[PDB]
Design a protein around this nucleic acid. Sequence first.
DNA 1: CCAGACGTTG
DNA 2: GTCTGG
DNA 3: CCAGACGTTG
DNA 4: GTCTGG
Length: 258
Amino acid sequence: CGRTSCHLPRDVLTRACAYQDRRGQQRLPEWRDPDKYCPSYNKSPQSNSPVLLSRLHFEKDADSSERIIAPMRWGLVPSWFKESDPSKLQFNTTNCRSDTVMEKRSFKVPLGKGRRCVVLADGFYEWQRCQGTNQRQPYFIYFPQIKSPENWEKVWDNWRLLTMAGIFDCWEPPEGGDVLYSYTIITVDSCKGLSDIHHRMPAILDGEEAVSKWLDFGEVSTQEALKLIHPTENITFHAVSSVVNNSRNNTPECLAPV
DNA sequence: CCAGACGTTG
DNA sequence: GTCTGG
DNA sequence: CCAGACGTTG
DNA sequence: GTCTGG
């Protein structure tokens, strides 16, 4: 739960986030900070990834079922943090355990303000600890996809983006600047399908109902939203080269079968 | 009351 | 900013 | 998440 | 062993 791929050109990403608001209107989410979208096969913490959030976080009186897409910093920086640079955070907010979320100062406050987001990715990476060797085996993990340079193009034109439950916070640099929007991905106990790879997995929102209810802090309370957080077996994976290991490596090899 | 934490993974 | 520990 | 640093003096 | 940087 500490590496993803999110490599699609921005317009292909945006079309893969085609959704329906509550009135059935087919929409594309509206961008904020599109210039901060940085497509890569190898997204690490402290990089920006595109996330979905309710229009109502940005626009007074908005339909809260309308969606915005914006790049956010991976690694939640709480509103109260006092240093000038956010990378001086001395605790890991890459992830946020489902089980303890209601009693963690860093996650509960933004959750209570309805700062629920959907972190987008092609899929995520996990490294398997194998008995009696220090060599870790990396896996690419993603939603089951539909059953040549024009073949690859069509796969990625039809790709079902992975949708992970996040929480975000807003931090004003003391020294002055843009509000930093930053996220954590909620982690849960791994499903049986993933149990031999890692005992943790991200909280995956499977289909537009779960995505919608997680996003809609208007009509969905924390309590009802937390019921969406749990493992899923609706997930496939394959082993991938050691190329992904180094986050500086940004190439299609990162998620290619081995 | 104030001081100090504020987090996850293996 | 808010909570826990002492 | 892993890779790579991990220090001071002028 | 533990932290920062990517």
